[PDB]
Every structure is written in structure tokens, then in C-alpha cells.
Design a protein around this ligand. Structure first.
Ligand SMILES: O=c1ccn([C@@H]2O[C@H](COP(=O)(O)OP(=O)(O)O[C@H]3O[C@H](CO)[C@H](O)[C@H](O)[C@H]3F)[C@@H](O)[C@H]2O)c(=O)[nH]1
Ligand SMILES: OC[C@@H]1C[C@H](O)[C@@H](O)[C@H](O[C@H]2[C@H](O)[C@@H](O)[C@H](O)O[C@@H]2CO)O1
Ligand SMILES: [Mn+2]
Length: 278
């Protein structure tokens, strides 16, 4: 399967740990990593590659110009501009009709095959519902969404890349931002929801288990489909630490955070400069 990550130099060490969690969870599947590289040093790219399977033979770094998204809002402090690179995925990857995009702050705990094998049809992508945003009464509607269209989290996305390449996603994004820039609160995540609403395949929350999913253990909707997708079917396949509290920081009380340090300690090569953040 083809996995996509996006990272700047600041997140190179975390990218490595996340990538290894993917390999660990798929002992008999070829994992081809495609990294949207917003400025990772040569040393950090070699370090990341050195810690992956085959010495990093299955990882390709794709240079992206962070300035491309300079005009887009950047209000969330823990997030850098690289968070918008995913919008040009159709321009960055030519060899894949389907890719599975993951944020850096994820820890894969179970096989992603069921998600990967999902047929997207003519939908733009497959994603899990964001309970945090869905319970933010009235927000969804601020960005033009209907009550029956569920707001998804942009941290785990099965992308119908073949469909994306038939359109100019960046232009559509810039136009959407121009229309909603004064109300959007979630940056790239708002854009994706706004552009693809009505053309989203919903995956079970086991593939994007965030703090709110954990706390959830009253549904915002009675819709049986909504309930089916938001009820996580155990075991958790993907832990996603969205928000300012990350597993690589101090006193992370988020569930499953200890697997991060456990993976970091299993790293083959750890540069002196990674000792701090890991
Ligand atoms: O120093 C940084 C900070 C962020 N990033 C990138 O930006 C993504 C953006 O942020 P988080 O994963 O920390 O975002 P968060 O999960 O808290 O936020 C929700 O809203 C975000 C909005 O911009 C993203 O869409 C994200 O996918 C979604 F889950 C990271 O995965 C990473 O690829 C870097 O490369 N370096
Ligand atoms: O859609 C989730 C949303 C994305 C946003 O970018 C991120 O900063 C944010 O964090 C939440 C987190 O999901 C909650 O569990 C926590 O209680 O609050 C933070 C906001 O400070 O999540
Ligand atoms: Mn995230």
C-alpha cells in the first residue's frame, strides 16, 4: 500500500516513529512511503530512511514549496504551514491511483488493510468522522455543510487520487478559502470538508481514534449510519493525537501515548539531535 505523510524539518523525528508504526502493523505488506517534504534536512532524511525497512528503500521524499500556501490561515499554534501540502496531492504523486494519507501525530496499532481495501467509488476520499467538530453546534453550518453531511477529520484519508488528478484541487481550495476565510477555524481540514461534502465515504472511527472518541467512552445524530461509523469497532487501528497534546511531549495523558516512546526506543539509528525530541 502507498502511505503519504507531510512534514517539515521540525517533525522529521516524529515522522520516522509514525512510519515505523505503519511497518510494524503490516509485517507482510509492502509499504511504500511518499513524504511531502517541506524542508527536511539531508541528514534528517537519511536518518528517517535508515530506520525503516530495507534501510529505507521504500521511501521517497517529494519536495514541496511551503510558500505555496502562504495566504492560507495559520491560527492553530501547534501547526505549521506544511499542514496544507496535502491539498496538492494530485500534483505531487503520479504513480498511485489511491493513497492513504496520515498525519504525523498518529500511531498505527492494527492493520490498515480493511481501510485500504475500501472501495471509494467516485467519492473524493474515505475518512472518519470528527466527533469534536460535529458536537460544536452550528460550526459545520458556518462552512456550508448540511446537518446530514458529517464533518470528517483530515488526519487519516484514503484518497481517490485518480479522481483528484482530474481536477485542480489547489485552485478549488484557494477559491473556497476566499469564500470562507473569515469563519474557518480548522484550516486545511475545513477546506477538504467544504470541497468534498456529499462525496465522502465514511470509515469507522477505529481508523482515526482521537481524544474525543476516547472520552465518548450521547451521539449527536440518530442516523444509523452515523452511529455505525462513530461507534469504534475494537481494536483501535489508528491512535490520532490531534490537538496541542502530543505523545512526544511531557505529561501526555492521551490514551496509548506510551507506544510512542516504546517505538522511539526501538529505533535503529537515533541522531544526537533527535535525542531531545524523542
Ligand atoms: O511543526 C509541525 C507541525 C505540523 N506539521 C504537519 O501538520 C499536520 C498538521 O497538524 P497536527 O497533526 O498536529 O494537527 P491536528 O491533528 O491537531 O489538527 C486537525 O486540524 C489540522 C488543521 O490544520 C490538520 O488538518 C490535522 O489533520 C487535523 F487532524 C501534521 O500531522 C504535520 O504533517 C509539520 O510537518 N510540522
Ligand atoms: O478536529 C479536531 C481538532 C483539530 C484542531 O486542529 C486541533 O487543534 C484540535 O484539538 C482539540 C482536541 O481534539 C480535543 O480533544 C481537546 O480537548 O481540545 C483541542 C483544542 O484545544 O482538534
Ligand atoms: Mn494530527
Amino acid at each position: 500500500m502507498d502511505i503519504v505523510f507531510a512534514a517539515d524539518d521540525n517533525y522529521a523525528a516524529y515522522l520516522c516513529v509514525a512510519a515505523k508504526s505503519v511497518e510494524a502493523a503490516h509485517p507482510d505488506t509492502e509499504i511504500r512511503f511518499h513524504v511531502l517534504d517541506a524542508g527536511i534536512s539531508e541528514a534528517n532524511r537519511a536518518a528517517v530512511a535508515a530506520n525503516l525497512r530495507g534501510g529505507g528503500g521504500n521511501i521517497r521524499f517529494i519536495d514541496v514549496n511551503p510558500e505555496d500556501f502562504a495566504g492560507f490561515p495559520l491560527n492553530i499554534r501547534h501547526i505549521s504551514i506544511t499542514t496544507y501540502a496535502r491539498l496538492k496531492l494530485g500534483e505531487y504523486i503520479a504513480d498511485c491511483d489511491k493513497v492513504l494519507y496520515l498525519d504525523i501525530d498518529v500511531l498505527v496499532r492494527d492493520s490498515l488493510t480493511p481501510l485500504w481495501d475500501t472501495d471509494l467509488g467516485d467519492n473524493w476520499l474515505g475518512a472518519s468522522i470528527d466527533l469534536f467538530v460535529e458536537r460544536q453546534e452550528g460550526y459545520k453550518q458556518k462552512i456550508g455543510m448540511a446537518d446530514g453531511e458529517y464533518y470528517f477529520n483530515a488526519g487519516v484519508l484514503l484518497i481517490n487520487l485518480k479522481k483528484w488528478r482530474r481536477h485542480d484541487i489547489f485552485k478549488m481550495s484557494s477559491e473556497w478559502v476566499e469564500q470562507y476565510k473569515d469563519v474557518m477555524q480548522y484550516q486545511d481540514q475545513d477546506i477538504l470538508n467544504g470541497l468534498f461534502k456529499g462525496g465522502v465515504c465514511y470509515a469507522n472511527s477505529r481508523f482515526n481514534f482521537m481524544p474525543t472518541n476516547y472520552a465518548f467512552m450521547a451521539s449527536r445524530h440518530t442516523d444509523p449510519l452515523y452511529r455505525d461509523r462513530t461507534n469504534t469497532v475494537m481494536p483501535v487501528a489508528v491512535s490520532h493525537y490531534c490537538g496541542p497534546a502530543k505523545p512526544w511531549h511531557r505529561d501526555c495523558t492521551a490514551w496509548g501515548a506510551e507506544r510512542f516512546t516504546e517505538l522511539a526506543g526501538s529505533l535503529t539509528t537515533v541522531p544526537e539531535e533527535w535525542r531531545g525530541k524523542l
